[PDB]
Amino acid sequence: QMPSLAPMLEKVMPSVVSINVEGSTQKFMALGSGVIIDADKGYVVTNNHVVDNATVIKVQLSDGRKFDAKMVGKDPRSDIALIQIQNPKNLTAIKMADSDALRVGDYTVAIGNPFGLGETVTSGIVSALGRSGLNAENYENFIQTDAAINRGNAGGALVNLNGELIGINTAILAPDGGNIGIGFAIPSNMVKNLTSQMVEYGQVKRGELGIMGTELNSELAKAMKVDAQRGAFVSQVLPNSSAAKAGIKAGDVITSLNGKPISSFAALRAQVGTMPVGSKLTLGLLRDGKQVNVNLELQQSSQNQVDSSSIFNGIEGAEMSNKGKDQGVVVNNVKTGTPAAQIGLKKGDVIIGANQQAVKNIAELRKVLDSKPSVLALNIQRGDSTIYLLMQ
Amino acid sequence: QMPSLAPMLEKVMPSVVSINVEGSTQKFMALGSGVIIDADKGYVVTNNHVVDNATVIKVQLSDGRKFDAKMVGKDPRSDIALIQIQNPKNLTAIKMADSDALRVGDYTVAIGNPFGLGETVTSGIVSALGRSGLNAENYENFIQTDAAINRGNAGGALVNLNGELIGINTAILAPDGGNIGIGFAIPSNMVKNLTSQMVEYGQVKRGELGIMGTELNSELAKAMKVDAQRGAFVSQVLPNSSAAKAGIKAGDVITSLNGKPISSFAALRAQVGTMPVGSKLTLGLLRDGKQVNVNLELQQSSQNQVDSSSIFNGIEGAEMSNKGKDQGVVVNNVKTGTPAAQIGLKKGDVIIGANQQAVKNIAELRKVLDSKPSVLALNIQRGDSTIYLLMQ
Amino acid sequence: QMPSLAPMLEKVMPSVVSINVEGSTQKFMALGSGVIIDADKGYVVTNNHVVDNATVIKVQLSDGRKFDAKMVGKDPRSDIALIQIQNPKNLTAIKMADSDALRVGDYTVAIGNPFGLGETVTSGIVSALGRSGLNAENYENFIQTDAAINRGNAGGALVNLNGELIGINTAILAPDGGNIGIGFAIPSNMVKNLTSQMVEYGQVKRGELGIMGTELNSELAKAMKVDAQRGAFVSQVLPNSSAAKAGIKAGDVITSLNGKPISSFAALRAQVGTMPVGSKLTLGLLRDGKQVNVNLELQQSSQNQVDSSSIFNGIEGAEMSNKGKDQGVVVNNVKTGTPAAQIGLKKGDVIIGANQQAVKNIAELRKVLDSKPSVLALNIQRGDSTIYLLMQ
């Protein structure tokens, strides 16, 4: 006869986990949380800032069991990393909710490991949607909540009353490292995109529309005679970009992405910046007082991602990324005094295998390294020649 | 099928606003919140400590729109100031609830702008009623709540589940400027009195009963043989005061104001200190074990208010206040080295107009100043002579 | 038509009280809360760390009334002390709930006196059960909650929606003495045992099973081939102990106490460490993969409790404790330079009376001292002789 979050939590808690990390860049220990996304494969989502530069990562279930997990993907821009429990047995995954349907008045419960105390559940409400600005270079469209969140909670779950995952708790405005009623979480629709990508490739292939923009405030809207105090203001479209071909002109106000109204430029960025190259979307435009509807196809890009350090753990040097279909890892740009280039690693190389194993993309490459060989025999291709780079 | 504050908030949020201030006393910027009290006129309530000494104040709605607002009233003792949006178009006002019916177990949601992040809503419960003591010189009868409140929230709303305003969030007990679960808000019945007054005059005309008092604790109650551990203890009544005429004698315990029980002396003070001169009230007395009922009529006073600085913004000098009916602003007491007296401002003067505009009270006077003339031509009356004081 | 904790709180708040203490060890003042356990006798429970080393303790009801209270019991290991209001008139006691039925999703409201502001009520949920580790020497099986708790709250109540007491708020993880969303409370079943004991004897007579243990983590469980990631691991049983006689062998995993599953060793300890000598319990064992059920009878012990300082307030010296049935207070072990031994207090003595009053146990002894004589005439027995120790 007493209302309680107990029943829903009895089913959902096994899905959340605590993560222990051991790394070096100097030795360090870190701790946070993670959410089991796929029970069978043992995929566990979490903040990239928790497992970053980790030599060893161990996952601990709510029932006590400890497992070892290895990395599979990690996107610093959105701060979402995907690890995988080695030897997954009898896990429970969380079902994901559609974050686009969240409304500010909604209830929320957060689950995670504050200060290593163990699985802690605290509750509150959605205080705001679309918050961004914490770190202006990243993609951020944070859900804001007043459910208590402290250090240890990162990577943990943020669920609705029905037990569905709506976000991953990431950060907190807070002077003197102590929760104050203001916490942030990446919405779940982003986790579902960034994550599935990582599963199938090892990195996120970022697509761009090709427009330069800025937040459309009330002042700029007067100067530009537009009845709208919020939205994405198009500064200029790039030549031969998706937006160009679609018909978007500078001085345009983007007001909606796929039926959904667009809080601001930051969200629009985070939205498409989370979609995979080739996705078909439709933008809601506003040029010279008239409404407009256009169809776009996200295209390639020049996304700065996966550095030779995120896959080698310590091997400073050229950045790397997938190449076309599963054609292998490509070495983006080699620096100079960076250790990677100090082993024959030159920009333009295409790692097509390692230790007699084929490397179609970053995921597979990280698989060979997962076994931890004593000597890594890279089979790359420079121009029209096949060569071999050795390591230890 | 999920309970949520969303529906109520969809209607109420447009009513709350964020306030940006620019001032000097040295230049400064400040930010807080405000609540739209009257949609048509654009009246917006807020903490006096937010807009105080402000050269410029800008209001921003939840939809993005920005407007400029000018001051109309401000009472430092209760910490309630009333500003007005210039050119109000399509606003939503909040409906006010009767704060006297609040009970400690009640739910509350607070809306405001913590650290400029934007419209943030957080929730909790009424933790206590009648808190006072924060600043012993002011009038305080605070509602206490554990809904998260931080810097930026001042001037914001505190509403019940039905969306009705029960208070204005004002302050927070909190070491290291971070919410800790203890926040305070001026109840709404006070805002409704102090505010309506300001609208119609520019200041609050304070009425007094004319009694000296003190909190009636358990100890004093023994010494005085009174069965009551709480209430207002009458130390002495002033000669020719309302209380005197009504029949109140020293050694009396005031236990109720208009049917309503009286938490303490502080509340009693804050209660009547918020009512306008001439209001008809009835006090519940307790003299020598016997219950008593008396009828009073709040009378004049010697209220220290509106200084020549709150209307001139920087012109130190004599204090000012309305005079009788709309008879104009009266200059209370001129200091000495104060800039105001340094322009011919002498105590006893009665500003009856400014720049060829009639000044019936402080509101109108602040209207002429609102246009921001280059030279302010005061038409005051010293004794039986009409004179003119110039400014720039 | 609005849901509210008000109705339940109207009945329950009178039960909680604020406590003011004056002590010395140097003079000090302290403040906290307490819960009325028995209306008739005026028994009030509270944290031992609040009233410890107190020369004077005053209790203040929610209605204003102040009373003086004297101590009756106090257990530092569990941090529960029992005081008694002198001259109890018209009090309300709280009814206790069965804490073993609490589940993590459950709602909770906390009542107490943060920073002396007065009776404050804040709410939240059960974040976790069985937390321990705060102070590794004590008995701890804390309920964890995110209802706001700050200094002043210790000794206060933690109740469920029905108004029943489920715990006593004791401490908070919190950098910079400010609530952060993590608070702890001793569950009510412990308060009900530790407390009733104190009532009937002045101290808690601690019983032990006689086993050496440790938390059974996942690692130790592999090494020991046991399908269980949590429980109490038996390191060794003591000779002629209850556990010995019952049949418990080292290398055993205790997994349940009286039907109830056992979170960990810490809980198991806190559980039985709270039961009185002679209690009949049954343990759930797990030896060599096979389940086991055994019946035990808590036995004596060597519990380090009640020091000559907790009953004399300042008289350093030999520790003391009850003796057999109501046979009087026994002086455990006298130090050397300790003031107590500096008045003829030698270990082995059996205080059998004081100032012509019989002393059956520590409660009665503290009764004679309660009247505050000028000279305390102890009638103790050394060997086969009756002697008298004088004090002032």
XYZ file of N, CA, C and O in Angstrom, chain A residues 15-148:
536
model
N 21.640 -4.334 -14.269
C 22.133 -3.768 -15.509
C 23.244 -2.758 -15.307
O 24.065 -2.567 -16.192
N 23.268 -2.081 -14.167
C 24.313 -1.087 -13.951
C 25.497 -1.736 -13.284
O 25.318 -2.720 -12.557
N 26.701 -1.215 -13.546
C 27.931 -1.810 -12.992
C 28.923 -0.750 -12.544
O 28.819 0.406 -12.955
N 29.882 -1.136 -11.701
C 30.929 -0.201 -11.260
C 32.196 -0.600 -12.025
O 32.439 -1.781 -12.292
N 32.990 0.392 -12.391
C 34.189 0.153 -13.165
C 35.421 0.605 -12.426
O 35.440 1.701 -11.856
N 36.454 -0.236 -12.453
C 37.727 0.087 -11.813
C 38.794 0.103 -12.879
O 38.907 -0.826 -13.674
N 39.565 1.180 -12.899
C 40.588 1.356 -13.904
C 41.966 1.575 -13.334
O 42.117 2.176 -12.274
N 42.964 1.073 -14.060
C 44.384 1.223 -13.719
C 45.089 1.729 -14.975
O 45.056 1.066 -16.016
N 45.729 2.891 -14.896
C 46.402 3.400 -16.077
C 47.727 4.094 -15.838
O 48.339 3.965 -14.775
N 48.169 4.832 -16.852
C 49.419 5.577 -16.793
C 49.544 6.452 -18.035
O 49.017 6.112 -19.101
N 50.240 7.578 -17.883
C 50.468 8.527 -18.977
C 51.817 9.223 -18.766
O 52.052 10.331 -19.253
N 54.249 7.531 -14.299
C 53.084 7.945 -13.521
C 51.976 6.891 -13.568
O 51.507 6.514 -14.645
N 51.557 6.412 -12.405
C 50.496 5.417 -12.356
C 49.256 6.001 -11.679
O 49.369 6.804 -10.749
N 48.075 5.597 -12.143
C 46.835 6.095 -11.561
C 45.725 5.047 -11.483
O 45.737 4.033 -12.191
N 44.772 5.314 -10.598
C 43.607 4.468 -10.396
C 42.400 5.380 -10.521
O 42.427 6.517 -10.061
N 41.343 4.887 -11.151
C 40.128 5.671 -11.321
C 38.928 4.760 -11.148
O 39.050 3.533 -11.279
N 37.773 5.346 -10.846
C 36.568 4.544 -10.693
C 35.311 5.271 -11.157
O 35.184 6.480 -11.018
N 34.391 4.516 -11.734
C 33.159 5.096 -12.215
C 32.130 4.008 -12.444
O 32.224 2.914 -11.886
N 31.158 4.281 -13.296
C 30.117 3.313 -13.540
C 29.954 2.989 -15.011
O 30.588 3.602 -15.878
N 29.090 2.023 -15.292
C 28.852 1.648 -16.668
C 27.501 0.986 -16.778
O 26.960 0.479 -15.770
N 26.942 1.002 -17.988
C 25.663 0.366 -18.188
C 25.748 -0.740 -19.228
O 26.269 -0.541 -20.326
N 25.240 -1.909 -18.861
C 25.224 -3.058 -19.739
C 24.186 -2.834 -20.837
O 22.985 -2.802 -20.579
N 24.690 -2.698 -22.062
C 23.901 -2.451 -23.256
C 23.412 -3.701 -24.016
O 22.319 -3.678 -24.610
N 24.223 -4.769 -24.000
C 23.920 -6.060 -24.657
C 24.375 -7.202 -23.737
O 25.583 -7.426 -23.570
N 23.429 -7.958 -23.181
C 23.799 -9.021 -22.248
C 24.660 -10.111 -22.830
O 25.646 -10.514 -22.221
N 24.282 -10.592 -24.006
C 25.002 -11.665 -24.673
C 26.484 -11.333 -24.937
O 27.390 -12.071 -24.537
N 26.740 -10.212 -25.590
C 28.110 -9.849 -25.901
C 28.871 -9.185 -24.768
O 30.087 -9.023 -24.860
N 28.164 -8.795 -23.710
C 28.825 -8.133 -22.605
C 29.254 -6.703 -22.913
O 30.245 -6.225 -22.377
N 28.542 -6.013 -23.796
C 28.890 -4.623 -24.097
C 28.448 -3.744 -22.935
O 27.315 -3.867 -22.430
N 29.338 -2.850 -22.519
C 29.045 -1.947 -21.413
C 29.425 -0.529 -21.813
O 30.571 -0.253 -22.184
N 28.457 0.375 -21.742
C 28.698 1.770 -22.102
C 29.250 2.546 -20.897
O 29.105 2.114 -19.751
N 29.874 3.690 -21.147
C 30.440 4.473 -20.053
C 31.113 5.729 -20.572
O 31.374 5.837 -21.761
N 31.388 6.680 -19.686
C 32.048 7.919 -20.094
C 33.452 7.604 -20.569
O 34.166 6.793 -19.960
N 33.847 8.242 -21.665
C 35.172 8.015 -22.178
C 36.183 8.570 -21.201
O 37.296 8.064 -21.119
N 35.816 9.597 -20.445
C 36.781 10.150 -19.506
C 37.083 9.251 -18.303
O 37.958 9.574 -17.521
N 36.379 8.128 -18.160
C 36.582 7.200 -17.029
C 37.600 6.094 -17.299
O 38.392 5.726 -16.438
N 37.533 5.558 -18.509
C 38.374 4.465 -18.946
C 39.533 4.939 -19.846
O 40.364 4.145 -20.276
N 39.602 6.236 -20.117
C 40.665 6.776 -20.971
C 42.091 6.561 -20.450
O 42.383 6.839 -19.284
N 42.980 6.098 -21.327
C 44.369 5.846 -20.947
C 44.411 4.796 -19.851
O 45.145 4.938 -18.874
N 43.619 3.744 -20.013
C 43.578 2.688 -19.021
C 44.304 1.449 -19.513
O 44.010 0.925 -20.589
N 45.252 0.994 -18.701
C 46.052 -0.190 -18.979
C 45.243 -1.426 -18.616
O 45.389 -2.483 -19.230
N 44.384 -1.289 -17.612
C 43.551 -2.403 -17.156
C 42.187 -1.919 -16.649
O 42.122 -0.961 -15.856
N 41.106 -2.553 -17.118
C 39.770 -2.167 -16.650
C 38.965 -3.370 -16.153
O 38.777 -4.355 -16.875
N 38.500 -3.294 -14.909
C 37.705 -4.374 -14.329
C 36.275 -3.908 -13.968
O 36.084 -2.868 -13.333
N 35.291 -4.691 -14.410
C 33.871 -4.436 -14.203
C 33.307 -5.269 -13.052
O 33.565 -6.469 -12.984
N 32.537 -4.659 -12.151
C 31.953 -5.432 -11.054
C 30.429 -5.314 -10.984
O 29.885 -4.216 -10.793
N 29.746 -6.449 -11.118
C 28.290 -6.461 -11.095
C 27.699 -6.140 -9.737
O 28.415 -6.084 -8.730
N 26.383 -5.936 -9.709
C 25.712 -5.620 -8.459
C 25.686 -6.833 -7.524
O 25.572 -6.665 -6.312
N 25.820 -8.041 -8.085
C 25.796 -9.269 -7.279
C 27.141 -9.645 -6.678
O 27.229 -10.608 -5.916
N 28.186 -8.903 -7.033
C 29.497 -9.180 -6.487
C 30.519 -9.604 -7.517
O 31.691 -9.201 -7.450
N 30.078 -10.408 -8.479
C 30.963 -10.912 -9.520
C 31.850 -9.860 -10.178
O 31.387 -8.758 -10.495
N 33.124 -10.205 -10.378
C 34.067 -9.314 -11.060
C 34.492 -9.936 -12.375
O 34.652 -11.142 -12.453
N 34.646 -9.117 -13.410
C 35.086 -9.587 -14.722
C 36.113 -8.601 -15.256
O 36.264 -7.482 -14.738
N 36.826 -9.003 -16.299
C 37.776 -8.080 -16.893
C 37.130 -7.636 -18.186
O 36.407 -8.401 -18.841
N 37.340 -6.380 -18.533
C 36.771 -5.883 -19.767
C 37.868 -5.211 -20.569
O 38.836 -4.679 -20.014
N 37.712 -5.260 -21.882
C 38.644 -4.635 -22.791
C 37.851 -3.579 -23.555
O 36.628 -3.654 -23.661
N 38.551 -2.593 -24.087
C 37.932 -1.522 -24.851
C 37.565 -1.966 -26.271
O 38.183 -2.884 -26.810
N 36.563 -1.324 -26.874
C 36.180 -1.627 -28.253
C 35.995 -0.323 -29.032
O 36.256 -0.278 -30.234
N 35.545 0.733 -28.354
C 35.361 2.023 -29.007
C 35.487 3.164 -28.004
O 35.392 2.924 -26.795
N 35.709 4.392 -28.473
C 35.811 5.536 -27.559
C 35.824 6.867 -28.303
O 36.745 7.148 -29.049
N 34.800 7.687 -28.084
C 34.684 8.986 -28.751
C 34.781 10.164 -27.796
O 33.794 10.554 -27.180
N 35.968 10.773 -27.694
C 36.236 11.918 -26.815
C 35.329 13.119 -27.038
O 35.003 13.826 -26.084
N 34.931 13.367 -28.286
C 34.075 14.517 -28.563
C 32.730 14.425 -27.853
O 32.273 15.410 -27.287
N 32.102 13.251 -27.861
C 30.818 13.093 -27.179
C 30.987 12.540 -25.754
O 30.059 12.551 -24.952
N 32.187 12.074 -25.451
C 32.520 11.502 -24.154
C 31.808 10.182 -23.851
O 31.364 9.931 -22.728
N 31.717 9.333 -24.865
C 31.104 8.029 -24.729
C 32.123 7.000 -25.160
O 32.655 7.089 -26.261
N 32.401 6.030 -24.297
C 33.348 4.966 -24.625
C 32.595 3.655 -24.467
O 31.686 3.573 -23.645
N 32.955 2.644 -25.259
C 32.294 1.337 -25.194
C 33.294 0.241 -24.829
O 34.234 -0.007 -25.581
N 33.108 -0.411 -23.687
C 34.010 -1.490 -23.298
C 33.245 -2.795 -23.436
O 32.029 -2.793 -23.633
N 33.956 -3.913 -23.333
C 33.325 -5.228 -23.426
C 33.867 -6.207 -22.386
O 35.079 -6.434 -22.274
N 32.942 -6.761 -21.610
C 33.240 -7.716 -20.553
C 33.755 -8.998 -21.208
O 33.093 -9.575 -22.079
N 34.941 -9.436 -20.800
C 35.530 -10.655 -21.351
C 34.904 -11.866 -20.662
O 34.992 -12.003 -19.448
N 34.273 -12.749 -21.422
C 33.655 -13.924 -20.817
C 32.339 -13.607 -20.105
O 32.127 -14.012 -18.946
N 31.436 -12.882 -20.793
C 30.141 -12.503 -20.244
C 29.247 -13.693 -19.965
O 28.975 -14.489 -20.859
N 28.794 -13.805 -18.720
C 27.910 -14.889 -18.324
C 26.737 -14.394 -17.485
O 26.925 -13.780 -16.435
N 25.526 -14.644 -17.969
C 24.313 -14.291 -17.232
C 24.165 -12.855 -16.827
O 23.967 -12.577 -15.652
N 24.241 -11.956 -17.802
C 24.111 -10.532 -17.563
C 22.704 -10.072 -17.909
O 21.945 -10.782 -18.569
N 22.371 -8.868 -17.460
C 21.075 -8.243 -17.735
C 21.343 -6.923 -18.460
O 22.125 -6.094 -17.975
N 20.726 -6.703 -19.607
C 20.974 -5.427 -20.272
C 19.844 -4.450 -19.941
O 18.785 -4.845 -19.456
N 20.069 -3.169 -20.172
C 19.024 -2.212 -19.874
C 18.335 -1.972 -21.205
O 18.983 -2.081 -22.236
N 17.035 -1.687 -21.197
C 16.314 -1.407 -22.441
C 16.425 0.119 -22.594
O 16.359 0.849 -21.597
N 16.603 0.629 -23.807
C 16.726 2.079 -23.920
C 15.443 2.813 -24.267
O 14.648 2.356 -25.066
N 15.239 3.968 -23.655
C 14.045 4.737 -23.921
C 14.374 5.739 -24.999
O 15.532 5.951 -25.317
N 13.350 6.353 -25.568
C 13.552 7.344 -26.608
C 13.698 8.711 -25.933
O 12.703 9.322 -25.524
N 14.932 9.196 -25.822
C 15.163 10.459 -25.144
C 14.499 11.680 -25.770
O 14.281 12.674 -25.085
N 14.153 11.616 -27.051
C 13.512 12.762 -27.690
C 12.139 13.071 -27.094
O 11.641 14.181 -27.235
N 11.542 12.097 -26.406
C 10.228 12.268 -25.776
C 10.287 12.707 -24.309
O 9.268 12.717 -23.615
N 11.474 13.048 -23.820
C 11.610 13.507 -22.441
C 11.087 14.923 -22.332
O 11.279 15.726 -23.247
N 10.432 15.233 -21.222
C 9.937 16.584 -21.005
C 10.485 17.049 -19.673
O 10.714 16.244 -18.772
N 10.695 18.348 -19.531
C 11.258 18.828 -18.299
C 10.590 18.374 -17.018
O 11.285 17.976 -16.077
N 9.271 18.385 -16.929
C 8.720 17.917 -15.651
C 8.944 16.448 -15.211
O 8.659 16.091 -14.064
N 9.461 15.607 -16.115
C 9.658 14.177 -15.873
C 10.519 13.712 -14.713
O 11.514 14.342 -14.368
N 10.127 12.598 -14.107
C 10.876 12.043 -12.984
C 12.086 11.246 -13.473
O 12.065 10.701 -14.571
N 13.133 11.171 -12.665
C 14.330 10.424 -13.039
C 15.018 9.789 -11.840
O 15.031 10.365 -10.752
N 15.583 8.602 -12.012
C 16.360 8.027 -10.911
C 17.741 7.785 -11.536
O 17.834 7.390 -12.715
N 18.802 8.082 -10.782
C 20.180 7.893 -11.266
C 20.782 6.764 -10.469
O 20.586 6.702 -9.248
N 21.506 5.875 -11.155
C 22.146 4.712 -10.527
C 23.632 4.694 -10.875
O 23.992 4.847 -12.047
N 24.489 4.499 -9.876
C 25.920 4.482 -10.140
C 26.750 4.275 -8.888
O 26.205 3.962 -7.833
N 28.063 4.472 -8.985
C 28.935 4.263 -7.843
C 29.640 5.484 -7.277
O 30.831 5.667 -7.487
N 28.920 6.328 -6.522
C 29.574 7.513 -5.953
C 30.674 7.112 -4.963
O 30.449 6.291 -4.077
N 31.860 7.696 -5.112
C 33.007 7.404 -4.235
C 33.220 5.916 -3.904
O 33.541 5.569 -2.771
N 33.021 5.033 -4.874
C 33.236 3.619 -4.621
C 32.427 2.934 -3.538
O 32.670 1.772 -3.239
N 31.468 3.628 -2.947
C 30.629 3.032 -1.905
C 29.846 1.800 -2.390
O 29.498 0.922 -1.577
N 29.554 1.747 -3.695
C 28.775 0.643 -4.236
C 27.583 1.142 -5.041
O 27.484 2.354 -5.253
N 26.685 0.251 -5.480
C 25.528 0.672 -6.281
C 24.620 1.579 -5.492
O 23.940 1.160 -4.558
N 24.600 2.837 -5.878
C 23.782 3.790 -5.175
C 22.698 4.337 -6.093
O 22.967 4.646 -7.275
N 21.470 4.413 -5.580
C 20.399 4.980 -6.383
C 19.847 6.211 -5.690
O 19.562 6.203 -4.493
N 19.738 7.281 -6.466
C 19.231 8.567 -5.993
C 18.223 9.074 -7.038
O 18.306 8.691 -8.220
N 17.264 9.906 -6.632
C 16.257 10.393 -7.603
C 15.993 11.896 -7.656
O 16.390 12.647 -6.776
N 15.299 12.312 -8.705
C 14.985 13.717 -8.894
C 14.118 13.936 -10.120
O 13.265 13.098 -10.450
N 14.308 15.069 -10.794
C 13.541 15.344 -12.007
C 14.411 15.902 -13.114
O 15.559 16.287 -12.882
N 13.868 15.905 -14.326
C 14.550 16.470 -15.477
C 14.472 17.980 -15.230
O 13.392 18.561 -15.215
N 15.597 18.631 -15.009
C 15.528 20.054 -14.751
C 15.561 20.867 -16.034
O 15.038 21.984 -16.082
N 16.156 20.310 -17.080
C 16.275 21.044 -18.326
C 16.735 20.125 -19.459
O 17.296 19.038 -19.210
N 16.508 20.554 -20.701
C 16.933 19.752 -21.834
C 17.827 20.585 -22.742
O 17.735 21.804 -22.764
N 18.730 19.917 -23.453
C 19.630 20.594 -24.369
C 20.773 21.405 -23.792
O 21.367 22.209 -24.513
N 21.113 21.231 -22.519
C 22.215 22.032 -21.980
C 23.506 21.674 -22.688
O 23.764 20.508 -22.975
N 24.297 22.696 -22.989
C 25.584 22.532 -23.662
C 26.392 23.771 -23.346
O 25.836 24.815 -23.038
N 27.706 23.665 -23.419
C 28.530 24.816 -23.112
C 29.590 24.433 -22.105
O 30.551 25.180 -21.890
N 29.418 23.268 -21.482
C 30.399 22.799 -20.515
C 31.768 22.839 -21.194
O 32.677 23.540 -20.739
N 31.908 22.093 -22.290
C 33.155 22.083 -23.054
C 32.824 22.324 -24.537
O 32.561 21.386 -25.297
N 32.851 23.601 -24.917
C 32.531 24.092 -26.262
C 33.078 23.393 -27.514
O 32.629 23.696 -28.624
N 34.034 22.479 -27.367
C 34.575 21.784 -28.541
C 33.858 20.451 -28.793
O 33.800 19.959 -29.923
N 33.291 19.895 -27.727
C 32.590 18.620 -27.779
C 31.173 18.707 -28.308
O 30.677 19.781 -28.604
N 30.532 17.557 -28.455
C 29.154 17.532 -28.892
C 28.388 17.376 -27.596
O 28.595 16.409 -26.870
N 27.517 18.320 -27.283
C 26.772 18.213 -26.046
C 25.318 18.685 -26.172
O 25.028 19.771 -26.686
N 24.416 17.829 -25.705
C 22.980 18.071 -25.716
C 22.474 17.392 -24.437
O 21.575 16.539 -24.464
N 23.079 17.791 -23.318
C 22.795 17.237 -22.000
C 21.416 17.373 -21.405
O 20.770 18.404 -21.527
N 20.991 16.315 -20.728
C 19.750 16.318 -19.982
C 20.263 16.792 -18.619
O 21.324 16.325 -18.153
N 19.538 17.716 -17.995
C 19.938 18.239 -16.692
C 19.038 17.676 -15.594
O 17.807 17.679 -15.737
N 19.624 17.191 -14.500
C 18.796 16.638 -13.429
C 19.273 16.970 -12.024
O 20.471 17.177 -11.796
N 18.341 17.019 -11.076
C 18.728 17.316 -9.701
C 18.824 16.059 -8.837
O 18.893 16.166 -7.616
N 18.809 14.872 -9.459
C 18.987 13.634 -8.692
C 20.474 13.727 -8.341
O 21.276 14.119 -9.195
N 20.833 13.400 -7.098
C 22.216 13.498 -6.638
C 23.174 12.731 -7.495
O 22.965 11.557 -7.775
